[PDB]
Amino acid sequence: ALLSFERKYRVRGGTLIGGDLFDFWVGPFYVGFFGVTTAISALLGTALIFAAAAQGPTLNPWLISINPPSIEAGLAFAPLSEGGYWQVITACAVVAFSSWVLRQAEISRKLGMSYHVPIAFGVAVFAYVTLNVIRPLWMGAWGNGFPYGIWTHLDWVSNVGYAFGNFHYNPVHMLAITFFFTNCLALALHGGLVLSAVNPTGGTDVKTPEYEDTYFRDFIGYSVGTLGIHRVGLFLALNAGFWSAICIVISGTLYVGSWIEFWDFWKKIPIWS
Amino acid sequence: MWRIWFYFDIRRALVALHVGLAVLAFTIHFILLSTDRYNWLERA
Amino acid sequence: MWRIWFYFDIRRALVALHVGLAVLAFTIHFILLSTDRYNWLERA
C-alpha cells in the first residue's frame, strides 16, 4: 500500500498455484508461488554464473564468458568446468523465464486484466528457448548455443552469421528486421503523438483524440486510432520476436550453406528467366 | 512441529513440496548420468 | 484414503498427473534412444 491508491487493490485471490501460501507482497513486489520459483531459479543462475566466472581466466565483467560444452560432447550433460555450468544456467534461466510469465499471469488475474502481457513476454521466452535449447537439440550439440558473456555472445552472433556467408540474405531475417524497424518508427510516432496531445504549444488547452486523428490525417492521410496503435505496436513487436526465432532456428538445421545462394531461386523463375 | 500447519496450508504446501522434490530428483539423476563412475546407461 | 479427493479436484489432479507422466516417459525413452547400448532402432 505504498501508492496513494494501491491499498484497495491488494486483495487475495487470482493465483494459479499456491493459493494463500505465497499470496503476499515484499515491498512493491508481489511474490506468489511463481515469484518464489523465480527468486530461487534466478538467484541460483546468477550465483552459478559468478561461480563459473571465478573458475575462469578473469573476473572482468566485460570478459566473463560461461561457455557451452564442445560440439564433440554432443547433447550430453558435461562436467561443470567443461560446459556443465552453462547447461545448469540454461535450465535455471528457462525456469526463471517461465515462472516470470506465470507470475505475470497471476498479477494480471489479481487486477482483473487479460493475459496479453504474459503471452507477449512468452514470445521472447520462446525466442530465447529457440536460441539455446531447440536449435542445439535439432543441431545435435549444446556447443551451438551462445555463451553467457556480455561481449562473447556478440562473437557467437558474428561467427554464426558469417558461417552462412552473409546473414543479411536470410529472408526470415529480413522480415524480422523490417518488423523491428517498423516497431521503432511506430513507437516514436505513438509517443510523440501522445506527448504532443498532452503538452500543447501556444498556450492552448490539452487536446482531444480528434486532434490526434486530425494531425495524422493531415500528415500522411490516415490515422489508425488510439486502440489500433496499441494493437499494431503489439503485433509488430511480437512478430519481430517470433520471426527472429524462426530465422535463427532454420539456419543450420533446415538450410545449410550460404544464404546468398538461396536467392538463386529467384533468377530461375521461368517468367523472367 | 504440528503448529507449522497453523501458518501454512497442507493442500498448497504439498503441491509446492512435490514440485521441488521432482526438480531436485531430476537434477540429481542428471548429475549422476554426467559422471562416468555412476552413468548406468552408456555402458554395460 | 479418499480424504484427498475432498481437497483436490480429481479432474485437475488426473490431468496434471498424466501430463507429468507423459513428459517423464518421453524423456526416459529419448534418453534410452540416445545411448548406443539401449537404442532399439538403429541396429539389429
Binding site: 560432447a73 554432443g74 550430453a76 | 548420468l33 554426467s34 559422471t35 562416468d36 552413468n39 | 534418453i31 534410452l32
Partner: peptide, 20 residues
C-alpha cells in the same frame, strides 16, 4: 540431455569417427 557422458561422446567422435 542425452544418456551418455561428454567423455564418451568425445571419444566416439575422435576414435570411431575422426580416427578411422
Amino acid at each position: 540431455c542425452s544418456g551418455n557422458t561428454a567423455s564418451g561422446n568425445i571419444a566416439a567422435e575422435q576414435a570411431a569417427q575422426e580416427a578411422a
